[model samples]
Target chain A: SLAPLRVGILGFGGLGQAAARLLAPKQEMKLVAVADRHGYLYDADGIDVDNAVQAYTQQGSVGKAKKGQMSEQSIEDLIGEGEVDGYFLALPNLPNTFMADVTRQFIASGWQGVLVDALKRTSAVEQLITLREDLAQAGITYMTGCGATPGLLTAAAAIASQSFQEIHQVKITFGVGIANWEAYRATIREDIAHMPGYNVDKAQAMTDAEVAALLDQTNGILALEDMEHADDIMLELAGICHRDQVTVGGVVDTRNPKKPLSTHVKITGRTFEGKISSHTFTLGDETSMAANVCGPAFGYLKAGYGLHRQGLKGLFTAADVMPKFVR
Target chain B: SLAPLRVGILGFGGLGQAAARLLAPKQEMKLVAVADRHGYLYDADGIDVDNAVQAYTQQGSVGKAKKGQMSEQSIEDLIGEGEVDGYFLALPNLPNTFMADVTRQFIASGWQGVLVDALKRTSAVEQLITLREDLAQAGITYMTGCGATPGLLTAAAAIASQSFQEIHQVKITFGVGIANWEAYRATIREDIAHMPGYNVDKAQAMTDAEVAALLDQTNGILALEDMEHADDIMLELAGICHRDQVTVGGVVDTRNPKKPLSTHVKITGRTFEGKISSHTFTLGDETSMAANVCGPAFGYLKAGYGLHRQGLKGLFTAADVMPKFVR
Candidate 1:
């Protein structure tokens, strides 16, 4: 008899909850534990998943009773207890420091199993590499940097590169809504004025410092980098600048209210290098959130499925596991 | 009588003859000596300027009879004698090697004057800088790489930059003849493959290198960088990614004959610290050679003139000399 894959969720924020909800319906996986900085809740006999989530919604935190059992333990205790076969780390960037240390300790202990980290900004290359190496040694699977840019977009590039016998370029473009340009403006202002500690000659040559200075000076009305998250849908396009081969372009919409952020990837032959291959996708009101979550989530899911089927072991990106359609 | 600036023409090529013809009618300049590999022709009173050009055109080489009235010297012999106040080095890139060396020697011989080297592809930055410095030190005015890109396009960028109170970004996109696509292909191929030590990734990361490679590969078909240049005029829409304030989108024109080999240069206004500013220039081709040539040419000329007027002595680009046009 095959036991359902036991899963524990750390930092059950919006994204974490979303992931849990997705996995709840899957027959292959079962929710066993949920933890946050505030406290921890667990149920070995498959907790009333829907009820627990509802209680979390109503009580602000998961404080209400679920089914007939409730255990109040710290996240550290649940992580060290080895009560689950897998864990999902979904804290924000700063908070992930502690989460990472704990996950490392858990893996170091004999609790070796699958570990999926859904932290966006925290997934630097160094951290991702370290996680991969440690997990590999411990016979566990690990994934990192699942944001739209690092995850789905990169996956799209890889797919495009593979679809054509010879891909010479990849271009990706994305846009999102700009409800409050101040935040984006601040970010841009910081980037321009004093970037790299050198005074660039042209306005286009402003450094991050200059950008920040501008934002600080302007009091958030005028942005150093003018288009820092404006009202219009944010659009970004990046492609491989190559010759004699295929060039891929994508339009990612980050402002669609229904679909805050979604990535659309396209690949065309060399003849189309200068031509735009119209392909697009849209995701929700909180476009950044969607992009941050969906990109890595989809990337990891694809990677996991691939690894499970191929029996291959190593670090891989979305491009590694997806088909031509995604490419 | 104050003698008009005696202009020596080297290598009786199309460009050389054109220079001679143009200068012939100028009140302040006169065509003095014409030298080719075959022979040298000199006319103290101006070698039957029209006849000489015709003779050279009719005969593959300058006629010996015409050489008789001249110094009857080879190109080397003519360079040895400081006979003219101005020298027009109008030859191919290869000939510029000898021309550059000879011009330096001539300047050193106390021939404080102007040296106009119209040789195509010979106006490298290193050479331009060295020549400008040497000539300035020797009380000589020197200008090279004054052809389309260096002279015209660069000038246009400067002019555009100056057309605002606060100049931010300047972009210039130009097209080379389609026949030159082979050179462009070779250059593009080499750069894309990351040959000659630096890899494509490194090249892509470098704005200058990307520009250079793009120009090389397209045989100067595309804009070297988005800061300036494109097949057709396009506006840069905005967005943000990671820590960078980015612009996303470009225009493409299928109707243009040079559509296959066009470029786009998008300039953004941000200080060194990435602060956004309200200055930008979007340059597009009127497709008229006269306008393109004059815009850039006059732009640079005005800059040089300004520096001179301000009693400033040093090398300057269009971005340096133009006065910002404030509305």
Candidate 2:
């Protein structure tokens, strides 16, 4: 009924390349543009994922490859090229407002398309909410917090809450395991930012050796509790429960590939017939963090694509709508 | 110097009687009126605490004593008597809005005085906040949640929070002990209302034997976590932190007189120079619940009296003001 949607991957880091590879074989979407800090590559017919990644791995920038050019404002250049219908913003949310600022760029450029992000902080998502009307007026459909904890799991909570007349509490606990920390350095850094003594700036500024030294002090495991995750605000925005009724925490093990614990979300509430009950949805242990986050992110991109095609525009969190399955 | 400000005690139950006895020896204030469900007592000078409590214990109402009378509206009749300058509302907040409704009665009756309540529940306090402007306009000074968790420790939190530039979290954990359950049946029932599979109506309708059987299952200990206490809202009202940044939980031991855990509040935050630190304030374990609750209550009443003398009338929480020693 429609041609395959043209897609772009922003950031061009681990998540961006993973998304590129995932999009390569999909009939529902095609990768046409990719951008990193140094440069961007755009090919209307569909960029070569293998070539772009190979240039990035060997040259430190994707622009070194053919059909790409080095530029300071690679994202702006890619937006000017205007070949993609939707973009997965696989950018680091270190400043927390990085994604929100990029959102402003899209609005100022008058770019009309669907944008999806795997944002993590409650305050960051709150910033997006302030731009809701601006986004709608700009004809941009923004899907935010579409990652694992606040993304896939938050959507699950919205569905699970329908069984209860009143929600008492929603708890999200995750366990992530990576055999070599270097492979997911950015992911680990974002997690370290949530530690007691560290924040976004401190964690982002840490060198590889600094991270290793901190890991040595804790035996390569980080146990966190009462984290300020965006799931709370997303659920609250969807009217499922108050932000205080939700809590997010998790344990991360960097030395072992085996998960320390299965990721799960539990919803406790009172039923219509006056019965107290709980519903728990546990994620599979075999799936990697990339698969969980990148997978739902694209699904939500497709969902947002549907909204864009319908001429509807606004900011929507993962809890606001269900994602579509990408074939 | 001020002719010993006159005071009244509402609700002649365990807490009310304890409050009466506590006031009996105080020189700064004298008890002038007492009320219960069935009747009320009034005296321009101090009423006889021993005789009033004895009459309540023997005849199920304080009106059985001399200088007291049976009345259809005891609280209203006592308000009309109008000899007291302040009243300690030592009432059970079973129906959460009961205190707020009584506040309404004071406003409607045009009784100009100070009112203090050791109330519980965030929703109940929120109800009182709705009438803030009304209380000010009606010439009534109201103090809410002036009990242990939201009372004594809440004031301490307000003080300790001054050390931090930004407050991360405020956790209030309390442990209450009672040697005999019968002596504080109402207190135990109020706590039972917080347990899962139970609510205010269910807890209030529970028979004495039913409560005993329930306690038998837990070995006479009630362990609760993430309770919906008023400390969160009260602290938020004082501009200390967002309500979501505060949590309240505790363990209650009814069979033994020794506390299961020390009642304390911990504030974790980052300082101006970027040092992450915490402050913990623990209450003395020797003090009984009545001593902790009623003592600070009368003190806050004295504090409220100061506001009344200054012609300031409106709603205030324990966190918003420091109490003065009655002596």
Candidate 3:
């Protein structure tokens, strides 16, 4: 109908490959270019994602592209002249890089298009907040954490918040099911890593020293310090309010020696009306929550791009543009 | 119509009244007796629940009952002598009683009938585990925590465990919304109250003393230590193996200030196959979870008593006999 939205894929890893594969057959959008760590590939006439995957898998690159030598044209030129509408940043994480740096780079280069990414660990967005007002003024829509925790659950939480007149606490439960025993320890470490406050009955009441001492003494499964975590910070950015009351956490269920490892999310809130209600979203038979996020990621990309094309601009959370995707 | 199952209501509080109200209108069960700290009231023909609540609310007694001289028969006579098929113990806490104890007491007195309760502050059950084998040998089916968390969630965890070849962890998420502002701080305080352990990125790696100091400090919201709680204990009794791997916890979602407090349960598990998945069942718009226990509580009573009549014996959890009730 509308010229299929021309897009580029950055970072040709599993997620990038999955996105290319899913986007390949669809007539709604065209994969115009792909880039991996080895080099960048581009074609203004639209690239064949299937062939690109095969080439990259076999030759270590989206080999033999139509234009732009790997050494000559920077990835910025693939879209700086308006050759593509949007690009998916499926690149691997740089231990020291913030995702915002990539988006800021492209936007600053004068290419005003939608940028989509999803994640849970949000320290990456900390420095990026500095770019907020300028991005809004320049009419670039930057969507953050469109994956699962910050993406899907945040949207659901935002939607659920509309049901109340005023709200207090926002609890986000992130869960997943893992069938890969090889990744068990890694799978669990994600939930327990890089978070603060700590788990317990009266954790918020405890002294930081005591909490630290407690952390030093336990050799068992403990709880998540949900409030004041990453989800809370992001949800606060989305205007859900009561930042201090936002609680987010999850765990692996190993109830019996007979079932697979599983994850679950229970997002709850308390109201002035005196009701404690929550919504929980859970998934099964999976290794990582991010792997299963492609569907929603696709939704966010579509919505964010549509908004960009319609002259709507600014920083948007998945919750802000969910109607375009969910409907 | 079948003859009603003669029953007694212990601890004449609001919960006891609600149970009595629901049990009275049904032809399946009869409220034959009720007891309070004041003493006991009985009527073999059947006590009028609405009238009883009115009497209790207005005069603080089921008042001037027609069937018994309060002095002639003890509360024990109501059940110990084969009069009641089962009774609902909705007693006020003395902070010294575990629900398992009351069930143990009545069951130990030779009344092999149904018992129903549900709760989360597991310290109550800490002492009751001592009487386990003796009651099982005596052929008593004592059910603990039929109200909500201990009741419904444990049932779900047990049922879910059957799906696995072997399980390593069972993570349970318990959340509630508040509708009565009067009880909000009180309801929430219970979650933030006394308990041990502190939150850390790696709680399972801490020493007991360190965990204790963590619990000694913070006074606000915290995480859950699921392994040794009542839910864990009950799941262990449900025959779910890997007793050491049960992980459970909950967070209060004070997200909004305008809606009613609600309750939710997210059940998840991991098996030897290494798949970790979870399911969330959230109840919408309720004043209290324990208040609404009548639904599941009724199911437990009808099913537990039915099994008793069929000559099936031994302790039964909602998980073991849930099929009898749900179907």
Candidate 4:
């Protein structure tokens, strides 16, 4: 409608590229730049999207959207130049410091554009809230986590909460689906030990380290588990529950319906007295399983980009703007 | 503020007398009428509370609050006169139809006082909702679940949903402390076989009897069991989850919390993002396991009583009036 406002996909990681693949053909916005973990590629004439995804997947992290359109422009210089209208950063969200640092850079670059990235953890949200005045002053509207489950959980929860007369408390539950559990098993087995101690810390741990250390262990070590964990999230949620004054715990994979409702982000609230309200916008069903895998990515991307053209300021979850996404 | 309201502890079972013992001694209300299971005990000049509790506990359920002040008035005739402010009914709460029938009698008796009873099963809730206008129109203030955990779960949920900005879905979990493994283990064994033949079934005339008369049971029958089950409350809650929402299950011990924070009715709510908010109000920590044991009962009672003097009218759970119990 507004001449395809200049858009850029920054940080070409797994989610970044996945989002990039889905967001490319959308007619509402133009994809002018695509950045990987390392370099930045820009096309003033608007880069072709599928071409970029093909390049990234086939050629590894370093790929081209077109021939010879690469540039070594620093992130600071590019935004400071005031050319890109909006940037979607899909950075790896952990170690709060990295995410916080990037957030600072965008604010520092004197750039007044929409920032759509994943608020992958709480620390980022804490940091974002502290910068509300600054971002609002800069005319930057941000929606964190364009295509993540807990993030999308926020989006859908916002939409669902509208239907209720009274809301007691809310919980966000999330599970993701990867094609091979055998692969995940190995990862979980290898990494589960390294996971910070929470529920049951067996002095040093057992059921896990045995497979790797034993001379003739069972097929347990290959359970490479990089899971987003239920207990740790439980503890984290316990803290959130304390601060927000909500008394409901929507803990996942724990005390719930007996069905395998896995690989989804859950949003639930208890209200209207003995009743709880919920919506589980899925990622993939893990029944060998799945959803319109990219439905969420595209939904958030456009919602973040096109929902409020004037841009939103302050710290907001996917939920805050989710209402607009629906109608 | 209000003269001790005329109180009648209805029914003479274990829970009934237990609640009667507690309610009669409470300073906020007066034990004016204490009804044994089959007879009416009225004392316009106030009943001897301790005498009655002692008699019931020692001399069996026909015990009196005083030596010779029992009456022949029926429960219906007693309430029909409009002399009773509230009647706390502690009926046996299972095989829902009985509870529903009790609810109907109370409604049919032209009763206008507060009808406080534990509609222990879901069917009671269904029956209660069916005639809400009848109770409200008769000027009756009805509170669902006098002290059942499903009811307490309902109460806390109503109280807890108040603390959040967005609500997705909700769950209500109930637990009760019934002393003894022997009694429970016996019940589960006898009932579990009749419980729809989970693992294997031998065919009789083509259906249920075969499971009972199998030629040889599998080792799987023994192996297939590991859970303490959520009660009729599970399949019961399944329907609740289906109608309202899912994924979160916070269960409490059949009573209250005394130790730091657990084994009590826990209310947790997650936000649109993955942060869950929760809180637990304790029964007694320094006192004894004894207080935690009975805390949930009195908690809901005072919560229901103190929350509104004019009284509430509608199909409601204990949760709807739980806020006042906290502070």
Q: Which candidate is the best by TM-score?
A: 2
DockQ of 2: 0.01
Model 4 chain B — which ten-residue stretch has the worst lDDT?
A: B219-228
lDDT of 4 by residue, B1-327 (tens): 156666676666555555554454345556666666445566755766667767665665443435423445456555654466666666543343555566667777776666666544444566676777877776666666545344433333332232222234443332223332122232223223333454112111233334223412431122212222221232233222233332222222212222222223333443222344443321212222222212234444444454334345544444333212111
lDDT of 2 by residue, A1-327 (tens): 168888898887777887787676567677889998899999988889889999998898899878888998888888989668899999987577878888988999878999999988888888999999999999999999987878877866664554344678899999888887987788789989988989888999899999999999877999989998999998887767899999999989999887798887877775433456565555546555676677678777977987688676999888765465454
Which residue pairs in model 2 clash with each other? none
The count of residue-pair clashes in candidate 4 stands at 50
Cand. 2 Cα-lDDT: 0.80
- Show model 4 residue runs off by greater than 4 Å: A54-74, A80-83, A158-173, A180-194, A197-261, A264-298, A304-312, A323-327, B1-327
* Winner by lDDT between candidate 3 and candidate 2: 2
Off by over 4 Å in 2: A1-327
How well does candidate 1 reproduce the true complex, by DockQ?
Answer: 0.01
lDDT of 4: 0.43
Q: Write the per-residue lDDT of candidate 3 for residues B1-327, one digit (tens) a residue.
A: 367777787776655775665565456567788876555677777886666776666766664443332433345555553477777767633444535556556765766766655445455554555655665666665555565566655554543342233455666655543333223332333443433532212343444455445435542234544523466666666555544665556644433332233344444554223456554445455434443355456556766676566555555554444412211
Q: For all candidates, what are the clash counts?
A: 92, 0, 108, 50
In candidate 2, residue B26 scores what lDDT?
64
Task: Give TM-scores for every candidate, taking all chains together and pairing residue i with residue i.
Answer: 0.35, 0.51, 0.44, 0.39
Ranking by lDDT: 2, 3, 4, 1
At residue B266, candidate 2 shows an lDDT of 78
